[PDB]
Design a protein around this motif. Structure first.
Motif, mmCIF file in Angstrom:
data_model
loop_
_atom_site.group_PDB
_atom_site.id
_atom_site.type_symbol
_atom_site.label_atom_id
_atom_site.label_comp_id
_atom_site.label_asym_id
_atom_site.label_seq_id
_atom_site.Cartn_x
_atom_site.Cartn_y
_atom_site.Cartn_z
ATOM 1 N N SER A 115 0.826 -1.202 0.000
ATOM 2 C CA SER A 115 0.000 0.000 0.000
ATOM 3 C C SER A 115 0.862 1.254 0.000
ATOM 4 C CB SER A 115 -0.933 -0.004 1.210
ATOM 5 O OG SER A 115 -1.640 -1.227 1.306
ATOM 6 N N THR A 116 1.925 1.269 0.805
ATOM 7 C CA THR A 116 2.796 2.436 0.847
ATOM 8 C C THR A 116 3.472 2.670 -0.499
ATOM 9 O OG1 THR A 116 3.198 2.228 3.224
ATOM 10 C CG2 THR A 116 4.845 3.410 1.919
ATOM 11 N N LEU A 117 3.950 1.601 -1.140
ATOM 12 C CA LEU A 117 4.741 1.750 -2.355
ATOM 13 C C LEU A 117 3.879 2.061 -3.572
ATOM 14 C CD1 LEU A 117 7.258 -1.186 -1.844
ATOM 15 C CD2 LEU A 117 7.770 1.251 -1.703
ATOM 16 N N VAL A 119 -0.113 2.254 -3.666
ATOM 17 C CA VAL A 119 -1.324 3.055 -3.517
ATOM 18 C C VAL A 119 -0.969 4.528 -3.365
ATOM 19 C CG1 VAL A 119 -3.390 3.427 -2.135
ATOM 20 C CG2 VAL A 119 -2.568 1.102 -2.544
ATOM 21 N N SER A 120 0.140 4.822 -2.685
ATOM 22 C CA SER A 120 0.578 6.206 -2.551
ATOM 23 C C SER A 120 1.233 6.715 -3.829
ATOM 24 C CB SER A 120 1.545 6.338 -1.376
ATOM 25 O OG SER A 120 2.770 5.687 -1.656
ATOM 26 N N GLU A 121 1.702 5.809 -4.690
ATOM 27 C CA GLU A 121 2.288 6.231 -5.957
ATOM 28 C C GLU A 121 1.243 6.830 -6.885
ATOM 29 O OE1 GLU A 121 5.339 3.467 -7.272
ATOM 30 O OE2 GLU A 121 4.982 4.089 -9.347
ATOM 31 N N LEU A 122 -0.027 6.465 -6.703
ATOM 32 C CA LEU A 122 -1.075 6.984 -7.574
ATOM 33 C C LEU A 122 -1.260 8.483 -7.392
ATOM 34 C CD1 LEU A 122 -3.670 4.125 -7.068
ATOM 35 C CD2 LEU A 122 -1.976 4.330 -8.877
ATOM 36 N N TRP A 123 -1.000 8.998 -6.190
ATOM 37 C CA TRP A 123 -1.167 10.425 -5.940
ATOM 38 C C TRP A 123 -0.277 11.270 -6.837
ATOM 39 C CZ3 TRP A 123 -1.231 10.755 0.160
ATOM 40 C CH2 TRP A 123 -2.330 10.026 0.619
ATOM 41 N N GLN A 124 0.804 10.696 -7.370
ATOM 42 C CA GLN A 124 1.640 11.437 -8.305
ATOM 43 C C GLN A 124 0.863 11.816 -9.558
ATOM 44 O OE1 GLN A 124 5.195 9.174 -9.043
ATOM 45 N NE2 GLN A 124 5.839 9.204 -6.893
ATOM 46 N N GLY A 125 -0.171 11.054 -9.893
ATOM 47 C CA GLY A 125 -1.020 11.367 -11.020
ATOM 48 C C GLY A 125 -0.448 10.876 -12.339
ATOM 49 N N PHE A 128 -2.982 6.892 -13.105
ATOM 50 C CA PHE A 128 -4.362 6.600 -12.746
ATOM 51 C C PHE A 128 -5.304 7.467 -13.573
ATOM 52 C CE2 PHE A 128 -7.062 4.532 -9.598
ATOM 53 C CZ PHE A 128 -8.230 5.253 -9.712
ATOM 54 N N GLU A 129 -6.379 6.864 -14.070
ATOM 55 C CA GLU A 129 -7.367 7.553 -14.884
ATOM 56 C C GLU A 129 -8.755 7.354 -14.291
ATOM 57 O OE1 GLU A 129 -6.476 5.654 -18.637
ATOM 58 O OE2 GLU A 129 -4.388 6.016 -18.068
ATOM 59 N N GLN A 130 -9.684 8.214 -14.715
ATOM 60 C CA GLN A 130 -11.040 8.156 -14.184
ATOM 61 C C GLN A 130 -11.678 6.797 -14.433
ATOM 62 O OE1 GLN A 130 -13.647 8.768 -11.962
ATOM 63 N NE2 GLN A 130 -13.038 10.882 -12.410
ATOM 64 N N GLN C 181 -9.176 11.705 -5.163
ATOM 65 C CA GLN C 181 -9.469 11.309 -6.537
ATOM 66 C C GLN C 181 -8.794 12.247 -7.528
ATOM 67 O OE1 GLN C 181 -10.483 8.700 -7.653
ATOM 68 N NE2 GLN C 181 -11.692 8.876 -9.533
ATOM 69 N N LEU C 183 -6.062 14.023 -6.958
ATOM 70 C CA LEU C 183 -4.628 13.761 -6.894
ATOM 71 C C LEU C 183 -4.266 12.522 -7.701
ATOM 72 C CD1 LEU C 183 -3.760 14.520 -3.154
ATOM 73 C CD2 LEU C 183 -3.543 16.017 -5.139
ATOM 74 N N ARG C 184 -5.068 11.463 -7.587
ATOM 75 C CA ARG C 184 -4.823 10.262 -8.377
ATOM 76 C C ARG C 184 -4.948 10.552 -9.867
ATOM 77 N NH1 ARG C 184 -7.608 7.292 -3.988
ATOM 78 N NH2 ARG C 184 -9.595 7.480 -5.107
ATOM 79 N N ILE C 185 -5.965 11.321 -10.253
ATOM 80 C CA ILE C 185 -6.241 11.551 -11.669
ATOM 81 C C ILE C 185 -5.269 12.574 -12.242
ATOM 82 C CG2 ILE C 185 -7.973 12.296 -13.330
ATOM 83 C CD1 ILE C 185 -8.935 9.827 -12.293
ATOM 84 N N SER C 186 -5.329 13.793 -11.707
ATOM 85 C CA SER C 186 -4.430 14.896 -12.107
ATOM 86 C C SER C 186 -3.176 14.786 -11.251
ATOM 87 C CB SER C 186 -5.105 16.213 -11.936
ATOM 88 O OG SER C 186 -6.475 16.127 -12.296
ATOM 89 N N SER C 187 -2.347 15.820 -11.175
ATOM 90 C CA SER C 187 -1.057 15.761 -10.443
ATOM 91 C C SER C 187 -0.691 17.147 -9.920
ATOM 92 C CB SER C 187 0.026 15.219 -11.336
ATOM 93 O OG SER C 187 0.171 16.001 -12.512
ATOM 94 N N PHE C 235 2.113 7.067 3.450
ATOM 95 C CA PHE C 235 1.897 7.438 2.056
ATOM 96 C C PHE C 235 2.709 8.673 1.686
ATOM 97 C CE2 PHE C 235 -2.451 5.342 1.021
ATOM 98 C CZ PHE C 235 -1.933 4.124 1.402
ATOM 99 N N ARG C 238 6.524 7.998 1.556
ATOM 100 C CA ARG C 238 6.902 7.437 0.265
ATOM 101 C C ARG C 238 6.997 8.518 -0.803
ATOM 102 N NH1 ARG C 238 8.746 6.383 -3.742
ATOM 103 N NH2 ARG C 238 8.543 4.510 -5.042
ATOM 104 N N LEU C 239 6.073 9.475 -0.794
ATOM 105 C CA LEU C 239 6.000 10.499 -1.828
ATOM 106 C C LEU C 239 6.964 11.656 -1.611
ATOM 107 C CD1 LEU C 239 2.137 10.647 -2.218
ATOM 108 C CD2 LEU C 239 3.714 10.194 -4.096
ATOM 109 N N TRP C 242 9.190 12.737 -4.323
ATOM 110 C CA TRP C 242 8.420 13.376 -5.383
ATOM 111 C C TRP C 242 7.962 14.773 -4.983
ATOM 112 C CZ3 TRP C 242 3.095 14.433 -4.745
ATOM 113 C CH2 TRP C 242 2.465 14.977 -5.868
#
Lengths: 308, 308, 308
Positions: A115-117, A119-125, A128-130, C181, C183-187, C235, C238-239, C242
């Protein structure tokens, strides 16, 4: 391709959850322990087989493993490995507490690290898509935390279990809004429709973990969680003809975790003399549904439509 | 077009909620029972009239009923019928418990069936749209569940009431995020602006239901729910000049349910000697606002601007 | 432009939160009170300086103040003024309760008025955009309410504190889904990445406020809030590579509020003999991180890279 999809880990996962649910009925029913033992042995054997297959995948099919790990939607199914490991540790705790604790800690550390590696990587954007807002996202963020909380509470770490359970619950109520909105707007492709059963999972998994942590005390929170879980169950029962529009498939084991957690919470509620009739109905319905899932899997195996 | 919009059921809904709120003041104030009786009789008469009109609509205007049922945004206003039925059953419980139980169960089954059949069809996608994220969606998923929970708790089914209340609470928490994001992003057309008062509803309806199930005990959850309800009330008070930008209309009765639930929770808080001044202010404000709504409705009726 | 960004108020805010966290350790250590006094004095001096600078801005740079107030994304940083005022009042309460009460009430009224006037104005739509869903939005809606609840609980208004705390908690639960959402989608562009530390804030600020209102009683809710706070902390850990992709900057003080609230909740948990090791780790980590932030700010000041 690889014969075993990573999502097939829901078979041992659901079987182990049902085994624990039955195990909680040890006293009131003499054969409950025997049923729990049979289910736990079957789940452990299936989990060992799938672990060996996934090790083979890592050794000779690492490209597919990397592709699914880096995918914004397929990565969430790798969280089934630690979840099933923790459930198998929960099963083994009735026999050898040391191995059970080793497995539980391995699974907890693995799922937390995943999850740390990832799930938190998705926040970079960007990645991940809608359209990647699928119910399977519950597995790393929600289901893993609840399973770890229940397992830790089984070992006696009730405060650490509370921490994990709260993390899972808040992640669940933070992700479900956007997920249900996406389902309302963007529908869901037939191949991903079978994963709709994971929507039933968090509501009942949360109450199961809560009842495990607090010594099976049926507070107001447990009743609220059943309220939402039954609302979700009715919603998905109405949608089942739509979910299986393209036909029965092994993907329906996603409902297995939710049904098994419903059975576990039903045993917990029945012990508490709270909503005994509803608890009996929920337990029987969960057992019958998982039995139908087992029959479907056996039919697929006989027909050869199981492995890819 | 039918002379009676389905959203006009908010008149009996608000009147009945205010009747129950006053009824809770039976012991403290001698004329509280008389005010409750008057409000309940008026609400029951209006509800009977509207039920007859809607039966006429079903008999001779079934095309409009089908159109509103299948619409992703207008379907939520059909949930006012079971809600008003349950509120009228709550009113009648003070006189004939058997008829009250019959009405409460009819309304609960109807609203649960409606939510299962329609609120879950949206997950199929394609019909619901981002522009359909309106405050009125609270009625089938949230308001109905809270009303059913309070009604069942009135009949003595406190565990079933807890289940329904939890379903409604988690549905509210799951839907409000996307609703408020849509309001921030996409505004709201003047015709649908009057429905903004339904945003006030869930926060106070939840606490009213909770205080109904738990024997009017002012727990921490009730205080939290008033915190959010008052934040929402201030937010909507600031926006009221914007909500009535195109002028007053019968659509403002959407605020009636929230105001009446605020009054009910105010009575419950006052009985508990918790924030007595705030409780008095909330009760008086709710009563004055609903009285202004009644005056506006009477002026519309005399002016002939009530039926469509 | 004006030398002082409105977001620089996170320096006194974080320092004051850390001062309160240390002050909670008055009895255990002899020098905890001295450290709290030093931190509170520094935070109060910085807050006075920044208040004078912002008054100068309003008098001679009102155009920038209006531009940031009307901006859908930059307005949320004006909420740091009432928040820091309430924290400074909390600090002063140990010396002169009357001035502390005056400051706390001024800040509470100011933040409530700001939220009513601006946060509710967004619902009109057309100015807020999907790309304005930044973590800084927590400041007016969530952080302000939690700080007001904690301050009111300090003065003895525990029911009003509960109201404010519940408002903040539900606002946080309602906004975080769409924020994550997005943050995941956009950046978060590099200039806004430093504000990602505000994601850590609500989870720990909520538990700090809750432990403040309920007399530092470690309840299940506090454990759940730490569960989510630690998930968020991992989370963001990890980021962090970034987040600082373009380099360290004074914007990293956004993490200061979350770290200080983590330290405060750690002191509260340690007093309650709940997860003492985790409490010690959290307290030490928060102090070390805020000390690194202080060193970075001092280096920026010496290097002349602090003011614009």
């Amino acid at each position: 391709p690889f014969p075993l999809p990573t999502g097939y880990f829901g078979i041992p996962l659901g079987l182990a959850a049902l085994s624990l649910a039955w195990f909680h009925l040890e006293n009131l029913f003499p054969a409950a322990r025997m049923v729990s033992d049979v289910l736990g042995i079957v789940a452990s054997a299936v989990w060992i087989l799938f672990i060996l297959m996934y090790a083979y995948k890592l050794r000779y099919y690492f490209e597919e493993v990397r592709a699914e790990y880096h995918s914004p939607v397929r990565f969430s199914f790798i969280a089934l490995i630690p979840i099933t490991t923790m459930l198998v540790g929960d099963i083994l705790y009735r026999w050898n507490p040391l191995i059970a604790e080793v497995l539980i800690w391995i699974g907890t550390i693995g799922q937390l690290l995943f999850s740390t590696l990832r799930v938190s990587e998705l926040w970079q954007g960007g990645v991940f898509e809608q359209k990647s807002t699928h119910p399977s996202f519950y597995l790393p963020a929600v289901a893993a935390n609840f399973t770890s909380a229940s397992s830790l509470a089984l070992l006696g770490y009730h405060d650490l279990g509370y921490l994990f359970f709260g993390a899972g619950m808040i992640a669940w109520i933070i992700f479900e809004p956007v997920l249900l909105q996406h389902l309302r707007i963007s529908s869901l492709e037939p191949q991903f429709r079978a994963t709709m059963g994971i929507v039933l999972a968090p509501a009942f998994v949360c109450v199961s973990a809560y009842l495990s942590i607090n010594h099976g005390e049926v507070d107001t929170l447990a009743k609220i969680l059943w309220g939402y879980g039954f609302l979700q169950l009715f919603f998905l029962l109405r949608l089942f003809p739509w979910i299986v529009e393209k036909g029965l498939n092994i993907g329906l084991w996603a409902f297995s975790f939710g049904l098994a957690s419903m059975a576990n919470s039903a045993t917990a509620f029945y012990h508490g003399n709270v909503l005994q009739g509803v608890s009996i109905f929920a337990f029987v319905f969960s057992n019958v549904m998982i039995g139908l899932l087992v029959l479907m899997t056996i039919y697929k195996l006989t027909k050869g439509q199981f492995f890819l």
